[PDB]
Every structure is written in structure tokens, then in C-alpha cells.
PDB file of N, CA and C in Angstrom:
ATOM      1  N   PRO A   1     225.089  71.490 -45.269  1.00 16.05           N
ATOM      2  CA  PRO A   1     225.195  73.138 -45.983  1.00 16.05           C
ATOM      3  C   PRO A   1     224.066  74.016 -46.454  1.00 16.05           C
ATOM      4  N   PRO A   2     223.783  75.061 -45.891  1.00 16.33           N
ATOM      5  CA  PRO A   2     222.596  75.787 -46.412  1.00 16.33           C
ATOM      6  C   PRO A   2     222.637  76.013 -47.835  1.00 16.33           C
ATOM      7  N   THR A   3     221.724  75.408 -48.795  1.00 16.26           N
ATOM      8  CA  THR A   3     222.036  75.553 -50.232  1.00 16.26           C
ATOM      9  C   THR A   3     221.106  76.754 -50.576  1.00 16.26           C
ATOM     10  N   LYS A   4     221.613  77.843 -51.046  1.00 15.67           N
ATOM     11  CA  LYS A   4     220.915  79.027 -51.558  1.00 15.67           C
ATOM     12  C   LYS A   4     220.404  78.867 -53.027  1.00 15.67           C
ATOM     13  N   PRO A   5     219.414  79.520 -53.295  1.00 15.92           N
ATOM     14  CA  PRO A   5     218.808  79.529 -54.857  1.00 15.92           C
ATOM     15  C   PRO A   5     219.507  80.427 -55.588  1.00 15.92           C
ATOM     16  N   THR A   6     219.530  80.336 -56.782  1.00 18.56           N
ATOM     17  CA  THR A   6     220.317  81.076 -57.781  1.00 18.56           C
ATOM     18  C   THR A   6     219.678  82.450 -58.063  1.00 18.56           C
ATOM     19  N   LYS A   7     220.336  83.356 -58.561  1.00 18.03           N
ATOM     20  CA  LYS A   7     220.069  84.702 -58.790  1.00 18.03           C
ATOM     21  C   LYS A   7     218.918  84.825 -59.836  1.00 18.03           C
ATOM     22  N   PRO A   8     217.696  85.328 -59.405  1.00 19.85           N
ATOM     23  CA  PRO A   8     216.615  85.347 -60.703  1.00 19.85           C
ATOM     24  C   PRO A   8     217.014  86.041 -61.702  1.00 19.85           C
ATOM     25  N   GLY A   9     216.615  85.513 -62.871  1.00 20.39           N
ATOM     26  CA  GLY A   9     217.076  86.153 -64.247  1.00 20.39           C
ATOM     27  C   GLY A   9     215.787  86.831 -65.069  1.00 20.39           C
ATOM     28  N   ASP A  10     214.915  85.814 -65.348  1.00 19.39           N
ATOM     29  CA  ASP A  10     213.725  86.225 -65.875  1.00 19.39           C
ATOM     30  C   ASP A  10     212.512  86.255 -65.024  1.00 19.39           C
ATOM     31  N   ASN A  11     212.793  85.502 -63.647  1.00 18.32           N
ATOM     32  CA  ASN A  11     211.912  85.576 -62.712  1.00 18.32           C
ATOM     33  C   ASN A  11     211.984  86.423 -61.689  1.00 18.32           C
ATOM     34  N   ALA A  12     213.132  87.515 -62.042  1.00 21.57           N
ATOM     35  CA  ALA A  12     213.320  88.622 -61.267  1.00 21.57           C
ATOM     36  C   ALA A  12     212.221  89.555 -61.175  1.00 21.57           C
ATOM     37  N   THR A  13     210.927  89.328 -61.353  1.00 22.49           N
ATOM     38  CA  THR A  13     209.889  90.113 -61.484  1.00 22.49           C
ATOM     39  C   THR A  13     209.529  90.919 -60.049  1.00 22.49           C
ATOM     40  N   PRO A  14     209.542  92.092 -59.913  1.00 24.76           N
ATOM     41  CA  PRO A  14     209.667  92.778 -58.611  1.00 24.76           C
ATOM     42  C   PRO A  14     208.806  91.989 -57.440  1.00 24.76           C
ATOM     43  N   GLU A  15     207.746  91.429 -57.707  1.00 22.55           N
ATOM     44  CA  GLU A  15     206.984  90.821 -56.599  1.00 22.55           C
ATOM     45  C   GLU A  15     207.529  89.557 -56.084  1.00 22.55           C
ATOM     46  N   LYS A  16     208.231  88.767 -57.206  1.00 23.41           N
ATOM     47  CA  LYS A  16     208.561  87.527 -56.839  1.00 23.41           C
ATOM     48  C   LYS A  16     210.031  87.673 -56.345  1.00 23.41           C
ATOM     49  N   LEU A  17     210.811  88.712 -56.928  1.00 23.20           N
ATOM     50  CA  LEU A  17     212.006  89.308 -56.469  1.00 23.20           C
ATOM     51  C   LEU A  17     212.070  89.595 -55.061  1.00 23.20           C
ATOM     52  N   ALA A  18     211.100  90.276 -54.552  1.00 22.01           N
ATOM     53  CA  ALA A  18     210.912  90.496 -53.130  1.00 22.01           C
ATOM     54  C   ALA A  18     210.864  89.321 -52.461  1.00 22.01           C
ATOM     55  N   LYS A  19     210.023  88.330 -52.791  1.00 19.08           N
ATOM     56  CA  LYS A  19     209.816  87.010 -52.138  1.00 19.08           C
ATOM     57  C   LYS A  19     211.302  86.215 -52.065  1.00 19.08           C
ATOM     58  N   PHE A  20     211.903  86.512 -52.921  1.00 22.60           N
ATOM     59  CA  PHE A  20     213.542  85.840 -53.285  1.00 22.60           C
ATOM     60  C   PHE A  20     214.271  86.500 -51.959  1.00 22.60           C
ATOM     61  N   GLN A  21     214.208  87.893 -52.029  1.00 21.49           N
ATOM     62  CA  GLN A  21     215.340  88.447 -50.775  1.00 21.49           C
ATOM     63  C   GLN A  21     214.437  88.112 -49.515  1.00 21.49           C
ATOM     64  N   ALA A  22     213.278  87.660 -49.403  1.00 19.45           N
ATOM     65  CA  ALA A  22     212.847  87.327 -48.179  1.00 19.45           C
ATOM     66  C   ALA A  22     213.215  85.763 -47.914  1.00 19.45           C
ATOM     67  N   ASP A  23     213.151  85.094 -48.633  1.00 22.77           N
ATOM     68  CA  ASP A  23     213.732  83.642 -48.610  1.00 22.77           C
ATOM     69  C   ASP A  23     215.026  83.678 -48.511  1.00 22.77           C
ATOM     70  N   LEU A  24     215.927  84.531 -48.975  1.00 21.35           N
ATOM     71  CA  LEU A  24     217.258  84.833 -48.669  1.00 21.35           C
ATOM     72  C   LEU A  24     217.667  85.282 -47.215  1.00 21.35           C
ATOM     73  N   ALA A  25     216.864  85.783 -46.622  1.00 21.58           N
ATOM     74  CA  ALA A  25     216.717  86.235 -45.371  1.00 21.58           C
ATOM     75  C   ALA A  25     216.958  84.878 -44.534  1.00 21.58           C
ATOM     76  N   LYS A  26     215.927  83.976 -44.772  1.00 19.14           N
ATOM     77  CA  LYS A  26     215.945  82.901 -44.208  1.00 19.14           C
ATOM     78  C   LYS A  26     217.272  81.828 -44.269  1.00 19.14           C
ATOM     79  N   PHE A  27     217.865  82.074 -45.352  1.00 18.86           N
ATOM     80  CA  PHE A  27     219.037  81.362 -45.981  1.00 18.86           C
ATOM     81  C   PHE A  27     220.117  81.855 -45.021  1.00 18.86           C
ATOM     82  N   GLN A  28     220.141  83.388 -45.031  1.00 17.03           N
ATOM     83  CA  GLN A  28     221.371  84.003 -44.277  1.00 17.03           C
ATOM     84  C   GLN A  28     221.280  83.903 -42.964  1.00 17.03           C
ATOM     85  N   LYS A  29     220.012  83.646 -42.195  1.00 14.10           N
ATOM     86  CA  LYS A  29     219.843  83.377 -40.912  1.00 14.10           C
ATOM     87  C   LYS A  29     220.477  82.046 -40.661  1.00 14.10           C
ATOM     88  N   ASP A  30     220.094  80.937 -41.504  1.00 14.70           N
ATOM     89  CA  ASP A  30     220.423  79.731 -41.263  1.00 14.70           C
ATOM     90  C   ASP A  30     222.045  79.674 -41.473  1.00 14.70           C
ATOM     91  N   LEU A  31     222.532  80.212 -42.467  1.00 14.59           N
ATOM     92  CA  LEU A  31     223.967  80.421 -42.697  1.00 14.59           C
ATOM     93  C   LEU A  31     224.570  80.737 -41.557  1.00 14.59           C
ATOM     94  N   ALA A  32     224.196  81.847 -40.778  1.00 15.97           N
ATOM     95  CA  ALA A  32     224.732  82.151 -39.488  1.00 15.97           C
ATOM     96  C   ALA A  32     224.831  81.023 -38.602  1.00 15.97           C
ATOM     97  N   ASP A  33     223.943  80.163 -38.496  1.00 16.54           N
ATOM     98  CA  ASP A  33     224.132  78.917 -37.858  1.00 16.54           C
ATOM     99  C   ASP A  33     225.291  77.883 -38.249  1.00 16.54           C
ATOM    100  N   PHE A  34     225.402  77.912 -39.514  1.00 17.22           N
ATOM    101  CA  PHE A  34     226.400  77.053 -39.964  1.00 17.22           C
ATOM    102  C   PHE A  34     227.710  77.495 -39.679  1.00 17.22           C
TER     103      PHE A  34
END
């Protein structure tokens, strides 16, 4: 099962938050396979 990361709290800084959304795109892509 595709394990997703948790919602950024203090690490929700704009630049890293964007990376997070990008990594979630990979998760959502793989989730579609699951």
C-alpha cells in the first residue's frame, strides 16, 4: 500500500511545501495503480 507522508506543520515552508505537493503527485499517481 502506497504510504503517504504526513501534513507538514512547521516544515510547511513555501519552498518545501511545494516539494511536498510534488511528492504527493507521485503518491497519487501510484495510488491510482493501487
